[PDB]
Design a binder for this molecule. Sequence first.
Ligand SMILES: CO[C@H]1O[C@H](CO)[C@H](O)[C@H](O)[C@H]1O
Ligand SMILES: CO[C@H]1O[C@H](CO)[C@H](O)[C@H](O)[C@H]1O
Ligand SMILES: CO[C@H]1O[C@H](CO)[C@H](O)[C@H](O)[C@H]1O
Ligand SMILES: CO[C@H]1O[C@H](CO)[C@H](O)[C@H](O)[C@H]1O
Lengths: 154, 154, 154, 154
Amino acid sequence: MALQLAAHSDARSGPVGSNGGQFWSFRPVRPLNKIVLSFSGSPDQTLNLISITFSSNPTDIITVGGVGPEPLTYTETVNIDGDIIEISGMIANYKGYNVIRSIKFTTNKKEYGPYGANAGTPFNIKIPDGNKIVGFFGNSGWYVDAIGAYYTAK
Amino acid sequence: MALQLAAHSDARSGPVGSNGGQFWSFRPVRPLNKIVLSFSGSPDQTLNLISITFSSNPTDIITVGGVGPEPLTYTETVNIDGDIIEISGMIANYKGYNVIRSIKFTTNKKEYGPYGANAGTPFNIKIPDGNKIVGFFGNSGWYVDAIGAYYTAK
Amino acid sequence: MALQLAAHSDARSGPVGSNGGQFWSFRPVRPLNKIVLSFSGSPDQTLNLISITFSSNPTDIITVGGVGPEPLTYTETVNIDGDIIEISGMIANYKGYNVIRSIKFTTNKKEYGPYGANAGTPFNIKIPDGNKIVGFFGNSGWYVDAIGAYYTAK
Amino acid sequence: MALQLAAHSDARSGPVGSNGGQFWSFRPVRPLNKIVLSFSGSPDQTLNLISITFSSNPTDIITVGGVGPEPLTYTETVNIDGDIIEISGMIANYKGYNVIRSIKFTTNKKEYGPYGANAGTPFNIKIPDGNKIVGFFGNSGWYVDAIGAYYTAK
Ligand SMILES: CO[C@H]1O[C@H](CO)[C@H](O)[C@H](O)[C@H]1O
Ligand SMILES: CO[C@H]1O[C@H](CO)[C@H](O)[C@H](O)[C@H]1O
Ligand SMILES: CO[C@H]1O[C@H](CO)[C@H](O)[C@H](O)[C@H]1O
Ligand SMILES: CO[C@H]1O[C@H](CO)[C@H](O)[C@H](O)[C@H]1O
C-alpha cells in the first residue's frame, strides 16, 4: 500500500575546477547562512585557499579540502544575508594541483569577496533568474579542487 | 583564455521501479515528440511491456529494454502533443523481475494511456507547477526496470 | 590556462520512498561514522522515525526531517564500524505521508538495525561488489520522505 | 507490494566547457560505437564544430548542437572500436560563445582524432582504471557548449 511518488533532485551547475580525490556534497534543508574559507599563507603576501566550511543554522555543517598536513594560518568568514545566486573566482596551480584559489559569493542584495589569491583562470557559476543556490558539491583533497552548486526556484 | 562558466544539469524526478542491468538516459535538445511502447502478449488479453522507444525529430532516438530474445507482438505508438508534465503507471512482476508494466503520459494538451497491464504497485512522476518533462532515464535489461524524468521551467 | 580536467560525481542508488518538501544531500570527504535516528513514540510500543542526523568526524553533520511540531522522544545512535555497503528498511504511511519508517545499515563488519517500525513496504539500497556507500541524499520535510546513497569503488 | 530495489545512476565526469541553452544527455544500453562530428568552415583553413551525433548504431542516436542557421560543410565519422576511456580537446570562442572546438577519443584499442580546431584552452575527461565511458551529457544550442561523460566499471 505504498505509491511510488517519484522523489526529486535539484538542478546542478558545474562543477568547474579540476578532478580531485573525493566527491563532496552538501545541500542542507534550510538556507546556507555562513561560509568559512581557510587559508595558509598571509594577506600581506599570498593567501592559499585550503578548505571551505559551509553551514546552515542551527547545526548543519561540512568542511571540504584541508585533509592534508599543511597548517592553516588565516580564515575569512562570510555571513550570508539571503540567497546566494552567483559565485565566481579563480583557478590556479598550488603545490602541483590546479585548485580553487579565490571565491566571491553574490546574493540578491550583496557581494562578498573575492577572497584568496585572485589570479589565474576565472570561473563563474550563474543560475536562471528567479532561482536560488541551495547547496554546493565538488571534488577535494588537500585543497578544494572543483565546485558546483545545487539550485532551485524562488 | 576561456571562462569556466559552469554548465547546468536539469533537475530529476525518480527513478521509480527497480534496479536493472544498465542505467539509460535520454534528454534531447528538441521536444520529445513520439514514444513507441513495445509488448509481447495480446491487446486482446494481457500486454507485457518489453521496451520503450523515445524519439525527437528529426533523428534523435533511443530504445531501452528489449535486449532479450522474446519476440514483440504489439506496439503502441504515442504521438506527443504538448509538453509532458506527468507520468504514472504500475510496477509488477514479469518473468522473474519487477518491471514497469503500464505507463500513462499526461501533457498540457492530452492524456495518453495507461498502456500495458494496469495492475500492480502504482508510481507517479509529478513536477512543480510551471515545469515540463524534457527527458527520461532509468534502468533496463530484458524489460524496462526503472524510469525517472528530467524536468525544467517552461 | 588551467586544464579543465573534468571532475567526478559519484554513482547514485535510489532514491526510494516518496517526494518531499526539500531535496537534501550529504557526502562528506571522510567516512560517515555516526548516524542518529530520532523518533516520536516509544520502543516498547511503536517508534515513529522523524529525523536522521548523519555525521563524519571531526565536525561534518547534517540533520534531515524534524521540521514539524511533533516532539521527539527516543533516539538510536549508530556508531558505524567499517564501510557501509547496504541499507534496507520499510516505507509506510505516517500521518498522511508515505515515509521511511525503519532503517538498517550494513557495513562490511556489522549490521545495525532495523531501527523504527519495521512494517510496510520494504526497500533495499544495494550496490555492486567492491563498492561502498560514501554519502546519502533524499527528500525530507516534517519526516524523512526519501533516501538514496552515493557509492564508489573500494 | 513491490520491493523498492533502489535503481542506480552512473557516475559522472564533467561537464567541461560553458553553460548553454539546453541540457542534453545520452546513455544508451548498448556500447557507443559511432560518433559523427559536423562542422562549418574548411578542413584546410579552420573547422568550426557545430554539432555532434552520438550513436549506438543502429538503434540509438542523438544530435546535440546545430539547431541554428549555419550550414554544415564537412563531417568526420568515427567508428569506435572498444571502450572509450578518455576524451580530450580544446574550448574556444566561436561567434560569441566559448564552445567545444576539437575532440579526441581514446579507447582501450586506439586513439581517434583530434578532430576540429586546434586552438583555445584544453579539457580532458579521464576515469578510474578499469572503467569505461558509457554515455555523454552536456549543454548545447547552436553549437556544443559543454560535455561530460557517464562511466561505470568494466
Ligand atoms: C595531494 O593529493 C590530494 O589532494 C589533491 C588536491 O586537493 C587532489 O584532490 C588529489 O586527488 C588528492 O589525492
Ligand atoms: C534478464 O535479466 C536482465 O533483464 C532484467 C529485466 O529487465 C534486469 O535488467 C536484469 O538486471 C538484466 O540482467
Ligand atoms: C507537512 O508537509 C511537509 O512534510 C512532509 C513529510 O515529511 C513532506 O516533506 C511535505 O512535502 C512537506 O511539505
Ligand atoms: C545562439 O545562442 C544559443 O546557442 C549558444 C551556443 O551553442 C548557447 O547554447 C546559447 O545559450 C543558445 O541560446
